[PDB]
Structures are given as C-alpha cells and as structure tokens.
C-alpha cells in the first residue's frame, strides 16, 4: 500500500481499536480507485481465530445500500416506479392511509412514522400484513423522515415483485453476481460458516437473529474484499457492464429529500463535499440519526452529485460497520468491526483518513 495510506490508517485506527476495545476489525481504503486492506485482532476470541480478508462480518443497515441499489435497478428496468402507490404491489393493504404512500416514501423513510424496528412478534406473512394494516401514521406522507427498518425493508420486498424472484434471488442475480461479490451473503452457506466472525456484546459472542424483513434491512454479511468492491462500484458506476445496475447505483445516490445538511438517497445518505466533520460526526449519534426531522422534496431529484460525501452506518448486536466514499476523488473507506461501538467514533476516524488522502 502507498506509504501515505499506511501512515494515516495506523495513526487513526490503532487508537480507535484500543479506546473502543474492538476485538477484531477490517478496513479497506479505496485510493484512486484501488483497494488496500488492513486487519486487526480476532474473528473468534476464544478459539483465537484472527480476522482475515475472508472473514465475514454482519453489515447491519449497510445492507440498506444493497436494497436501494436493487430497487434502483428495478426502476431502471421499468418494473417499478418510485411514484407507484404501495397498494399496486400489496393490494391487501388498500386503505385510506396506504393509498397515498408510495415506494419513494418507503425507500426514504418518509411514509409518516413507520417504526424503527419490525416488532419481534411479527414472524409470518399474515403477522406482517396485520402489522402494516393496523399501523397508525403520525404524519402525512412526504413531510417527516424517520429512519426505519419497516419502511425500506418493505420497499425491498415490494420492489422485486414484478421480477417474479425472491428478494434473495433478485439480489444474487442482479447485484451480487454481476459485481462478482462472491463472498457476500444474505444466508451464509454451510461451507462459509467457518469464516463467519462472532460479534461481541458485553463480552458475549452473538450472531444476529432472524427477523421479519431482516434480509432487506440489515441481513447481509460480507468480507472486506467484497465491500471494497461495492465501494468501487458505487464510485465508478459507468464502468459496470449492466446498464440497469449502473443506473440503479446512480438512482440510489440521487437526492430526493433534504434535511438540514443531508440528502436522502435510496439506502445511501449524502452531504456536499467538503463536509463540516462535526456535522456528520454528531449527526451519526443515534439521538440525532434516529429522530424525526422534516424533509423538503427535491424536484426533480438531483442526479448523483460527484462532489458528495456518500455514507451509511450499520449496527447489529455484536457488529458495527461504516462505509463512506467521495466519487469526485475516487476515494472511499470501509470499516467492519465485530463490536457495535458508537457511530461518532466511526465517522471521526473515517473522515480523518479520507480528508488526509484527498
Ligand atoms: Cl489476511
Ligand atoms: Na409526497
């Protein structure tokens, strides 16, 4: 790796790991479009299994960027439109409150107060229907942004209906396989479990449990190599051979809503580069990132802006992830850790590295 990258990564990540007591971590820096990998610590403490470039991490909500791109791909194929009402694809929901909620609202958390988590007691398709049927919105659609698994998770489930594929099959055939993400999984195959790191919560090893819409909202596991390639693809979509996938990535980084300094894409979130680091650092705190905030529609949606800070945080019980990149600079970073540690610490480290390398 270039000496500049080694210097800043070891200056930044090494103190972070000790200060946060992170058992194992993998970092990829994309510099001038090429990836450079770094690994620390253990994927399994008890068995002393080290983290490698093959170690699988739970991505948590970084999975939402795959869902956003998969939906974008379906838009580009002419299968769905963001302005379509939810009831076109789930007619059993036909009701006053749901006729005015579109796929855009679901994809961008602007449906009007869909909850952060799907209740743990929702365990069947009938449970899920009844859950959305009896949901009482708090705001009119298109006025408030409330980050929610039950929002974009439903977008992913509905966006694949016209394809006739399951969500996993559509993701595998339309995103993972064309991009050669051969070690990225919604369901880890038996032969790959050996690489599945343990997450650690309060000194206990944990893996994320099955939940309704987990695959769409937080159920992807990946290696640092595949995630570096995911950043490469989102940095340089025009190099992708499949037109609809290139366009899906561009659609996912387009700006549909504005809240303060940030713009909402499909899965991805964007700010104008250069950014005020305090904005994204403090803005990643859950007291802020999970709060309801008013939105302004952007008309037409702004096409993917090159001078952007594009990023997404992710968390499960035992894992914490972060992805950020700057298309104008061909510059990005992936941070995967098997402990869920505060988002502001992730963003601070990521910005220090990318700002030093611009
Ligand atoms: Cl390695
Ligand atoms: Na609206």
Residue numbers in the entry: 4 to 361
Quoted passage from the original study:
To enable future efforts on the optimization of bicyclic boronates, we report crystallographic and kinetic studies on inhibition of the clinically important class C AmpC β-lactamase from Escherichia coli (AmpCEC) by TAN, a previously reported model bicyclic boronate 2 (CB2), and a thioether bicyclic boronate derivative (CB3) that we have recently shown to have enhanced potency against some SBLs and MBLs in vitro. Many β-lactamases are encoded by plasmids, but the AmpC type β-lactamases that are present in most Escherichia coli strains are chromosomally encoded. While normally expressed at low levels, mutations in the ampC gene promoter and/or attenuator regions can lead to constitutive hyperproduction of AmpC in E. coli. In all three structures, analysis of the electron density maps for the AmpCEC active site indicates that the bicyclic boronates CB2, TAN, and CB3 have reacted with the nucleophilic S64 to form an anionic tetrahedral species in which the boron is sp3 hybridized, as observed for other bicyclic boronate SBL complex structures.
